[PDB]
């Protein structure tokens, strides 16, 4: 019903929103490691998904101005406006330097390195920097789902420039 | 006198603790620049030394327990956990990676290629890639001065475990 999916991504947004250190030390992909991993692009894969999904509530949440306490719409705002920070600069991560990411990955396990070793017959490249190259288009297509239900809104208004 | 340096050392507390989100995207050094710079390092090098310079601030701020606002002495220590996590993960990067970083640094002006031009008769590497190496040594210096000042307080009793 039009209850259930947005029950669901309800219970989504408010772990998002309470979680929020979590995803957005995932969610910035600020890396100290010296090398990305596929597993940690599974991950990643699976977050921009959600924000994706739960855009909608990201968008309402932090715009509702309820004549009350506005000490709280300021804050949902800015997590609304951290996230969103974080959703755009990975947009310009994994567009722009997605060649040299596809060339710094190494694999987690053997079924990774015999990945590594086997060609793609249509493309040479390894079979591994062709799942990572479709996890990073995964990346950008919900990451362009986000910002397209984030840019315009309901009634076709306007939402926050990406 | 003893108010003096107090006094300098309270304006750079909250000098570092107002602006902080912008000192721990400094102190994690999570450098999505795929070349480290020896001038983010001359910023690292300062900031490194004025964390050690407070340190004894950072522990008394998140430690008076007043019998009143019980709200803003948990939100001190939310702070001083986000940078000690910071300042002690370094201590980790540019110990442990400090090889790998003096051979990933790039120069960013013509006065640091002719630094890595030329060598050093003492070691060979070039000068540059001792500049590097010897800033360095002044991030673990004052790193190290902090852990102290972090792990052992006045009347020697045992701080925070770096």
């Given at each position: ?11 989504l947004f408010?772990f ?18 010296s090398?990305?991993?596929l ?5 990643l894969?699976?977050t ?7 855009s ?5 949440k ?20 951290r ?7 990975l947009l310009v991560?994994?567009?722009?330097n ?7 990955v ?6 990774e ?13 390894n ?16 990451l ?5 239900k ?5 009634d076709s208004?306007f939402?926050f420039?990406?």
């Open positions: 019903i039009g209850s259930d999916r947005n029950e669901i991504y309800q219970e408010d998002l929103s309470n979680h929020s250190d979590l995803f957005i030390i995932i969610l910035s992909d600020q890396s100290s490691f090398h990305p991993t597993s940690s692009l599974k991950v894969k699976l921009c998904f959600l924000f994706s999904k739960v909608s509530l990201f968008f309402k932090s715009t509702t101005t309820s004549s009350s306490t506005s000490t709280t719409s300021s804050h949902n705002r800015t997590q609304f406006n996230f969103h920070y974080c959703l755009i600069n991560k994994y567009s722009v997605s060649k040299q990411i596809i060339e710094l190494k694999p987690e396990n053997i079924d390195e015999l990945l590594t070793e086997k060609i793609d017959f249509s493309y040479r490249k079979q591994f920097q062709i799942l990572i190259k479709e996890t990073i288009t995964s990346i950008i297509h919900d362009l789902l986000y910002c397209r984030v840019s315009i809104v309901q208004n939402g420039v990406c």
